[PDB]
Amino acid sequence: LYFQGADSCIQFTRHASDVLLNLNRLRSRDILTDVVIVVSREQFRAHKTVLMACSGLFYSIFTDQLKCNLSVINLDPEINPEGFCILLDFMYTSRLNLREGNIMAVMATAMYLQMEHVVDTCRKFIKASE
Ligand SMILES: CN(c1ncccc1CNc1nc(Nc2ccc3c(c2)CC(=O)N3)ncc1C(F)(F)F)S(C)(=O)=O
């Protein structure tokens, strides 16, 4: 379905989420993935443009004339790979699987990746649990 947008243009309600769904299916099938992110010896295939769109850190890396060419990117090996995996899934789905047992790792990872809305959200949820 569609609706008359605030700019009087036709707007498709599911388009942005459908695009993201299709990009995640591409990732799942390893279609047009152009970077491997390595975290504590675990490898995650992804699309640079998606990473840049969601993360200040990846935005800086991939707009850098030298680093934009890299097909492998290593992160700090103290980063929790599950924390990364949760955030990568968030980038591709809008869904953040936050839990008692993962929230600290997720927040630390989001801080490192410069995903500020996620960091804020983790903070609010930590403060609620005080
Ligand atoms: C429309 N669908 C398809 N038709 C033909 C081929 C593939 C698909 C679905 N899969 C994908 N589809 C796309 N893009 C895409 C494609 C076909 C159209 C559209 C988008 C809009 C459209 O009207 N046809 N991108 C990635 C994938 C995926 F999952 F493989 F990684 S469907 C669900 O099977 O009815």
Short mmCIF file of C-alpha atoms and ligand atoms in Angstrom, two decimals:
data_model
loop_
_atom_site.label_atom_id
_atom_site.label_comp_id
_atom_site.label_asym_id
_atom_site.label_seq_id
_atom_site.Cartn_x
_atom_site.Cartn_y
_atom_site.Cartn_z
CA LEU A 1 0.00 0.00 0.00
CA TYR A 2 0.78 3.67 -0.44
CA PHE A 3 -0.42 7.01 0.88
CA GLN A 4 -0.43 10.69 0.05
CA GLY A 5 2.75 11.96 1.69
CA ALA A 6 3.22 15.31 3.46
CA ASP A 7 4.93 16.59 0.27
CA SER A 8 1.77 15.49 -1.74
CA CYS A 9 3.93 12.78 -3.38
CA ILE A 10 2.83 9.13 -3.40
CA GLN A 11 4.67 7.34 -0.60
CA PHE A 12 5.02 3.57 -0.27
CA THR A 13 4.72 2.47 3.32
CA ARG A 14 6.74 -0.76 3.12
CA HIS A 15 9.38 0.38 0.59
CA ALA A 16 12.24 1.27 2.94
CA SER A 17 11.74 -1.86 5.11
CA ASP A 18 11.41 -4.02 1.94
CA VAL A 19 14.65 -2.62 0.55
CA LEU A 20 16.34 -3.49 3.85
CA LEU A 21 14.80 -7.02 3.77
CA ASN A 22 16.16 -7.51 0.23
CA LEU A 23 19.61 -6.22 1.23
CA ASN A 24 19.64 -8.68 4.15
CA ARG A 25 18.71 -11.52 1.82
CA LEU A 26 21.60 -10.47 -0.45
CA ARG A 27 23.90 -10.54 2.56
CA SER A 28 22.57 -13.94 3.59
CA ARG A 29 23.24 -15.29 0.06
CA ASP A 30 26.61 -13.48 -0.16
CA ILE A 31 25.50 -11.49 -3.21
CA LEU A 32 27.53 -8.34 -3.94
CA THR A 33 29.15 -8.31 -0.50
CA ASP A 34 32.26 -6.17 -0.81
CA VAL A 35 33.83 -6.31 2.64
CA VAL A 36 34.65 -8.79 5.40
CA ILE A 37 34.65 -7.42 8.95
CA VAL A 38 36.92 -9.47 11.26
CA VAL A 39 36.25 -9.41 14.98
CA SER A 40 38.28 -11.68 17.33
CA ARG A 41 38.89 -14.20 14.47
CA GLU A 42 35.22 -14.27 13.36
CA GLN A 43 34.35 -13.04 9.87
CA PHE A 44 31.20 -11.17 8.85
CA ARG A 45 30.49 -10.48 5.16
CA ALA A 46 28.58 -7.24 4.42
CA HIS A 47 27.89 -4.31 2.09
CA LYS A 48 30.01 -1.20 2.66
CA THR A 49 27.15 1.19 1.80
CA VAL A 50 24.89 -0.31 4.49
CA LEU A 51 27.69 -0.14 7.11
CA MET A 52 28.41 3.52 6.20
CA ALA A 53 24.73 4.38 6.31
CA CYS A 54 24.42 3.12 9.93
CA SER A 55 27.79 3.78 11.58
CA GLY A 56 30.03 6.84 12.03
CA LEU A 57 33.10 4.64 12.21
CA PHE A 58 32.34 2.83 8.97
CA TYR A 59 31.40 6.16 7.37
CA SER A 60 34.94 7.50 8.14
CA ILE A 61 36.72 4.36 7.04
CA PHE A 62 34.92 4.09 3.70
CA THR A 63 35.12 7.80 2.81
CA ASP A 64 38.90 7.64 3.42
CA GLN A 65 40.76 7.58 0.10
CA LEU A 66 43.19 4.95 1.35
CA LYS A 67 40.84 2.69 3.33
CA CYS A 68 37.83 2.78 0.97
CA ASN A 69 39.71 0.20 -1.15
CA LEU A 70 40.09 -2.35 1.63
CA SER A 71 38.07 -5.55 1.28
CA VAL A 72 38.99 -6.73 4.84
CA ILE A 73 38.56 -4.51 7.91
CA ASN A 74 39.71 -5.59 11.38
CA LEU A 75 38.03 -4.25 14.48
CA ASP A 76 39.49 -4.02 17.97
CA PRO A 77 39.90 -7.69 19.12
CA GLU A 78 38.50 -6.84 22.53
CA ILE A 79 35.13 -6.23 20.82
CA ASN A 80 32.61 -8.94 21.57
CA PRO A 81 31.67 -10.60 18.26
CA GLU A 82 28.10 -11.29 19.47
CA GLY A 83 27.85 -7.55 20.18
CA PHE A 84 28.95 -6.87 16.62
CA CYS A 85 26.62 -9.52 15.19
CA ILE A 86 23.63 -8.00 17.06
CA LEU A 87 24.47 -4.57 15.63
CA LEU A 88 25.03 -5.83 12.09
CA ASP A 89 21.62 -7.56 12.25
CA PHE A 90 20.17 -4.28 13.52
CA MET A 91 21.66 -2.41 10.51
CA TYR A 92 19.99 -4.86 8.12
CA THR A 93 16.61 -5.24 9.99
CA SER A 94 15.80 -2.26 12.30
CA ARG A 95 15.56 -4.81 15.13
CA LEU A 96 17.89 -4.64 18.13
CA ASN A 97 18.00 -7.85 20.15
CA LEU A 98 18.86 -6.22 23.46
CA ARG A 99 18.97 -8.44 26.56
CA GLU A 100 20.26 -8.32 30.13
CA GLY A 101 23.17 -10.63 29.27
CA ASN A 102 24.25 -8.72 26.13
CA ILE A 103 23.39 -5.03 26.74
CA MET A 104 26.79 -3.96 28.09
CA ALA A 105 28.65 -5.55 25.14
CA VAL A 106 26.16 -4.12 22.67
CA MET A 107 26.52 -0.61 24.14
CA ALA A 108 30.33 -0.78 24.13
CA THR A 109 30.31 -1.98 20.54
CA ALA A 110 27.83 0.72 19.46
CA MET A 111 30.06 3.36 21.06
CA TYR A 112 33.06 2.09 19.15
CA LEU A 113 31.00 2.00 15.89
CA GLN A 114 29.49 5.49 16.57
CA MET A 115 25.88 4.37 16.39
CA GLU A 116 24.60 7.05 18.73
CA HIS A 117 20.86 6.34 18.75
CA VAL A 118 21.62 2.75 19.76
CA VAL A 119 24.02 3.96 22.50
CA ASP A 120 21.30 6.30 23.89
CA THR A 121 18.80 3.49 23.86
CA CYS A 122 21.15 1.14 25.71
CA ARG A 123 21.69 3.91 28.34
CA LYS A 124 17.96 4.40 28.91
CA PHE A 125 17.45 0.65 29.31
CA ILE A 126 20.42 0.40 31.77
CA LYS A 127 19.09 3.32 33.84
CA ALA A 128 15.60 1.74 33.95
CA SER A 129 17.22 -1.41 35.40
CA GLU A 130 18.74 0.60 38.30
C1 LIG B 1 9.84 -10.50 -6.25
N1 LIG B 1 10.57 -11.72 -5.82
C2 LIG B 1 11.68 -12.18 -6.66
N2 LIG B 1 11.46 -12.26 -7.99
C3 LIG B 1 12.50 -12.68 -8.73
C4 LIG B 1 13.74 -13.02 -8.22
C5 LIG B 1 13.94 -12.93 -6.86
C6 LIG B 1 12.89 -12.50 -6.06
C7 LIG B 1 13.03 -12.39 -4.58
N3 LIG B 1 14.36 -12.32 -4.01
C8 LIG B 1 15.10 -11.12 -4.09
N4 LIG B 1 14.61 -10.07 -4.78
C9 LIG B 1 15.33 -8.94 -4.87
N5 LIG B 1 14.82 -7.87 -5.63
C10 LIG B 1 13.66 -7.86 -6.39
C11 LIG B 1 13.41 -8.92 -7.25
C12 LIG B 1 12.27 -8.95 -8.02
C13 LIG B 1 11.40 -7.89 -7.92
C14 LIG B 1 11.63 -6.83 -7.08
C15 LIG B 1 12.77 -6.80 -6.31
C16 LIG B 1 10.51 -5.84 -7.20
C17 LIG B 1 9.57 -6.55 -8.16
O1 LIG B 1 8.46 -6.16 -8.46
N6 LIG B 1 10.20 -7.70 -8.59
N7 LIG B 1 16.52 -8.76 -4.27
C18 LIG B 1 16.99 -9.82 -3.59
C19 LIG B 1 16.33 -11.03 -3.46
C20 LIG B 1 16.93 -12.18 -2.70
F1 LIG B 1 16.14 -12.73 -1.76
F2 LIG B 1 17.14 -13.23 -3.53
F3 LIG B 1 18.19 -11.97 -2.22
S1 LIG B 1 9.60 -13.00 -5.18
C21 LIG B 1 9.68 -12.59 -3.45
O2 LIG B 1 10.28 -14.27 -5.39
O3 LIG B 1 8.22 -12.81 -5.58
#
